[PDB]
Amino acid sequence: AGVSEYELPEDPKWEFPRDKLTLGKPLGEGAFGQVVMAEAVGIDKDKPKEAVTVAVKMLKDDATEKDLSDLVSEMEMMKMIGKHKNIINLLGACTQDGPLYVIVEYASKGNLREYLRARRPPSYDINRVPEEQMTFKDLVSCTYQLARGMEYLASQKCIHRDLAARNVLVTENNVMKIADFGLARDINNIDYYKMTTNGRLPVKWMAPEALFDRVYTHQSDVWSFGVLMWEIFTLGGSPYPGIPVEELFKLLKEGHRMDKPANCTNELYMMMRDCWHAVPSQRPTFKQLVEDLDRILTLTTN
């Protein structure tokens, strides 16, 4: 809907009083918005005088209409999706009489790419965390958690469309959380989502159906999840290394696929390759990936 004339309706069950929100240090500053740490007094009903640390998503000064539209759309997607352990959960919003603030769970260890890169096995980096180096089991656990979140997402008939390590957050207790639902869509009762001619989805994570046929389904999210797996098992590597997106289009049509990451078993690399099957229906579902991943994690854990 046209944001320049749209009045955000009252939504008492999510509304949060501005006087109870204290903005703190910035957490992130993308192109389309900004996220800051805040203290939210009484946001959890169970401790009404207690302030809880939250993250607040808001517009920047030079925001566009599409920026506002995306922030609204993200807020509305998080309402319909509901709660899961592996999803950044919506906590509240300040929508009336002032700038739109979308209040979500705080993930104190930040985005997944930097989280993995800081936990790599021995450039000079002041951000490394030697005591938390990733084991193979940690990487599989990471993957399983994200597969559980996408399984819950798919079961809500929601496509995320922008799956990638940069859109995963890690909490204080090392819980993986899918974030950034600004491009997410509800596909209940439609079979597939119809893409515009040139989309706003990063090309190196897009399924071929979406790139070339303009269609997006859950199986398209499964393709992105495969690229995400590759990011995880290279410990925050960036995909199709050395291949500019302008050459990738043709390479994908010729069946080009990324090579096996150094830290990956053949088993897991085959799982990535299955996610990148040319035929969407021949990729595993998130339900199957959860089953496979649980089986592998159970073996590794023992």
Side-chain angles (χ1 to χ4, degrees), residues 55 57 94 116 118 131 175 189 209 226 235 237 283 290:
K57 200 157 194 163
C94 309
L116 297 176
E131 68 282 14
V175 178
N189 306 120
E209 325 80 82
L235 294 178
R283 298 164 200 159
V290 166

Coordinates of all heavy atoms in Angstrom, one line a residue, residues 45 55 57 94 116 118 131 175 189 209 226 235 237 283 290, unseen atoms left out:
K45 N 5.5 -9.2 30.2 CA 4.5 -9.1 31.1 C 4.9 -9.6 32.5 O 4.4 -9.1 33.5 CB 3.2 -9.7 30.6
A55 N 16.4 -5.0 20.7 CA 16.9 -4.4 19.5 C 15.7 -3.7 18.9 O 14.6 -4.2 18.9 CB 17.6 -5.4 18.5
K57 N 14.4 -1.6 15.4 CA 14.6 -1.4 14.0 C 13.9 -0.1 13.7 O 12.8 0.1 14.1 CB 14.1 -2.6 13.2 CG 14.7 -2.8 11.8 CD 14.6 -4.3 11.4 CE 15.4 -4.5 10.2 NZ 15.6 -6.0 10.1
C94 N 6.4 0.7 18.3 CA 5.8 2.1 18.6 C 5.4 2.6 17.3 O 6.3 3.0 16.4 CB 6.9 3.0 19.2 SG 7.7 2.2 20.7
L116 N 31.0 -16.7 12.7 CA 31.9 -17.8 12.2 C 33.3 -17.4 11.9 O 34.2 -18.1 12.3 CB 31.2 -18.4 10.9 CG 29.9 -19.0 11.2 CD1 29.3 -19.4 9.8 CD2 29.9 -20.2 12.1
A118 N 35.0 -15.1 13.3 CA 35.7 -14.9 14.6 C 36.1 -16.2 15.2 O 36.9 -16.3 16.1 CB 34.9 -14.0 15.5
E131 N 38.6 -19.0 22.3 CA 38.0 -19.9 23.2 C 36.7 -20.6 22.6 O 36.2 -21.6 23.2 CB 37.7 -19.3 24.6 CG 36.7 -18.1 24.7 CD 37.2 -16.8 24.2 OE1 38.3 -16.7 23.5 OE2 36.5 -15.8 24.5
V175 N 22.3 -19.5 20.3 CA 21.1 -19.9 19.5 C 21.1 -19.2 18.2 O 21.1 -17.9 18.1 CB 19.8 -19.6 20.3 CG1 18.6 -20.0 19.5 CG2 19.9 -20.4 21.7
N189 N -2.4 -20.4 0.3 CA -3.4 -20.4 -0.8 C -2.9 -19.8 -2.1 O -3.8 -19.3 -2.8 CB -4.7 -19.7 -0.4 CG -5.3 -20.3 0.9 OD1 -5.4 -19.5 1.8 ND2 -5.6 -21.5 0.9
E209 N 14.7 -21.0 -10.7 CA 13.3 -20.7 -11.0 C 13.0 -19.3 -10.8 O 12.2 -18.7 -11.6 CB 12.2 -21.4 -10.1 CG 12.5 -22.7 -9.6 CD 13.4 -22.7 -8.4 OE1 12.9 -22.4 -7.3 OE2 14.6 -22.9 -8.6
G226 N 20.8 -24.0 1.0 CA 22.0 -24.7 0.5 C 23.2 -23.7 0.4 O 24.3 -24.0 0.8
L235 N 32.8 -21.4 7.2 CA 33.0 -20.5 8.3 C 33.0 -19.0 8.0 O 33.9 -18.2 8.2 CB 34.4 -20.8 9.0 CG 34.5 -22.1 9.6 CD1 35.9 -22.3 10.2 CD2 33.5 -22.2 10.8
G237 N 32.5 -17.8 4.7 CA 32.9 -17.6 3.4 C 31.8 -16.9 2.5 O 30.6 -17.0 2.8
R283 N 14.5 -31.1 -4.7 CA 15.2 -30.7 -3.6 C 14.5 -31.2 -2.3 O 13.3 -31.4 -2.3 CB 15.3 -29.1 -3.5 CG 16.0 -28.5 -4.7 CD 15.7 -27.0 -4.8 NE 16.0 -26.6 -6.1 CZ 15.5 -25.5 -6.6 NH1 14.7 -24.7 -5.9 NH2 15.8 -25.2 -7.9
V290 N 15.6 -31.2 8.3 CA 15.6 -31.3 9.7 C 15.9 -32.8 10.2 O 16.8 -33.0 11.0 CB 14.3 -30.8 10.4 CG1 14.2 -31.2 11.9 CG2 14.2 -29.3 10.3

